[model samples]
Target: MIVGHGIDIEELASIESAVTRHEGFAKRVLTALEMERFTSLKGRRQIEYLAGRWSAKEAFSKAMGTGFQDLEVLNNERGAPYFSQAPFSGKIWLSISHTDQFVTASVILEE
Candidate 1:
């Protein structure tokens, strides 16, 4: 059964600015493996990727009613996003989308 739903949106410009101004911003948001994938992209794709992850994480936190801690998001072999590590034992559904200027994510928790 579905237990929670959460969504978040972020502006690419804002996230880009934060990345430029803060050296540790991405580190704070992404796990070690996520960072490795993040570093592989370039230019606009890089910002979009980061924004998507940030938005997804935010959505997950809202769904779980917790802060952005101890949870990591990762893509499966099919390139579908999933919670690589989380406190919950149930299922998690994630969807992320990006436009030229914005990124949005939705998360559903099932128990």
Candidate 2:
């Protein structure tokens, strides 16, 4: 059964601004493999990719009703984020999407 749900939206320009200001912003939010994929994109697409992952991670935390401090987000070989350590142990399923204007993410937990 579905244990939790999460959703989030981030402005495209905001993500671009953050990436410009912080060299490591994308690295911090995205996995190594994701970074590789991001590097292949052009300007705006790169920012959008990073922002989508960032929003997804935030949404996952929200669904768990806890912040990142309480839950560790790790990526699989496929670049999918999952719980490495947490206040609760379970399997997590995720879905993510983004448009030119915003990105959204959702998570469902099986505890």
Candidate 3:
């Protein structure tokens, strides 16, 4: 059964600017594994990746009814994103989408 659902959208340009201005912003937002993948990308793709993760994490926190710590987003071998760690023990679902100027994410918590 679904216990909670949350969705979030972020502007890519704003994320880009934030990361550019704030040192270690990405490090604060992404986990070690996510940082590995994030460092592999170049140019706009990097910002897109960061924004996607940001919005996904934000959506997840909303669904979990908590703040932005202890939740991690990772990817499978096929490059599908999932929660590697979270406060919840039940099933968690996440989806992220990107456009030219924005990224959006949705998370569902199930028990």
Candidate 4:
């Protein structure tokens, strides 16, 4: 069954500004390996990657039925977000996507 759902949108320009404003913003939001991959991007790809991850985190929180504070989201070795601790303990499935001007994410919970 579908336990939860979430969606988010981010403007390309907004992501660009964020990347410019925060030197370590990507690092803070993404894992070390992700950072490596992000840095390798040519230009817009970097912004898209960052924004996509941010949206995914938000979606994850929604699926978990808790705000950011309630569930501690962390990255695995693959740079995927995992619930290190939370009120609901179970397997989580995540899917993320982005276009030129927006990014979206969704999560599925198996209880």
Candidate 5:
């Protein structure tokens, strides 16, 4: 059964100032595993990564109605983001996309 769905879009251009001003900004928004993954990447990829995760988490929060837990996003073998430690024991679906200036994500919780 599908409980709910949520989506979010963010402008990459808007995140730059907060990132530049505070190193802890990303740290606070991302889980420990996400933090590890982002730093290992190079250049513009870091920007894309941050925006994607931010959007995904935001959507997931709204979808499941409660996201303030140990939830984290990890990639499957095909390189798609999946959730860990989510409230659902069944399946939690996530999709992410980004452009030069924006990023978007949708989360579907199957309960």
Candidate 6:
């Protein structure tokens, strides 16, 4: 059964500005493995990638009925975000998309 769903969108301009304002903004937002992949991108790719993961994490937490303290979102080879802590046992899925101006993501949880 489907137990939870969550969605979030983030503005690229705001993410970009935050990155500029803070020296390690990406580091703060992304995990070390995710940051490794994120640091390799340039231009709009960087903003979209960062925003997508951040948005997905937010959605995942909402779906799991949890806060940000104990969860981590990481991508597989196909670039799908999965919870590192394995919060649920049945199933979990994530989707992310973006335009030049915004990034959006959704997460689903089932048990």
Model 5: lowest-lDDT 10 consecutive positions: 64-73
TM-score of each predicted structure versus truth: 0.92, 0.71, 0.92, 0.70, 0.89, 0.82
Report how far residue 104 has shifted in candidate 2, in Å: 1.2
Which TM-score value belongs to model 6? 0.82
Candidate 6's residue-wise lDDT over 12-38, tens digit each? 898889889996888887767777878
- Which ranges in model 4 have alpha carbons more than 4 Å from their true place? 67-89
Q: Which stretch of 10 consecutive residues in model 2 shows the poorest summed lDDT?
A: 66-75
Report residue 45 deviation for candidate 1 (angstroms).
Answer: 0.9
Pairs that clash in candidate 6? none
Model 6 bad stretches (over 4 Å): 67-86
How many clashing residue pairs appear in each of the predictions shown? 0, 0, 0, 0, 0, 0
Model 5: per-residue Cα lDDT at residue 43: 72
Give the per-residue lDDT of model 4 (tens digit) for 9-91: 66778877877898766667766655676788877777877787777777776766663334444557996755565566667
For model 3, the superposed segments whose C-alpha errors exceed 4 Å read: 67-69
* Deviation (Å) of 91 in candidate 2: 4.0
Model 1 ranges with Cα > 4 A deviation? 67-69
The residue pairs that clash in candidate 1, if any, are none
User: Alpha-carbon error at 46 in model 5, in Å?
Assistant: 0.3
TM-score of candidate 1 versus the correct structure, residues matched by position: 0.92
Error of 4 at 111 (Å): 1.7
> Which of the two candidates, 3 or 5, achieves a greater lDDT against the reference?
3
Q: How close is candidate 3 to the true structure, as a TM-score?
A: 0.92
- Cα lDDT tens digits, model 5, 1-111, are 898799999999777777888978888877888889988987778988888887888898899776332668878899998786676686778999888889999998886
TM-score of 5: 0.89
Candidate 3 per-residue lDDT, tens place, 1-111, comes to 899899999999999889989868998998888889899998999999889989998998888777343667877899888888888899998999989999999999999
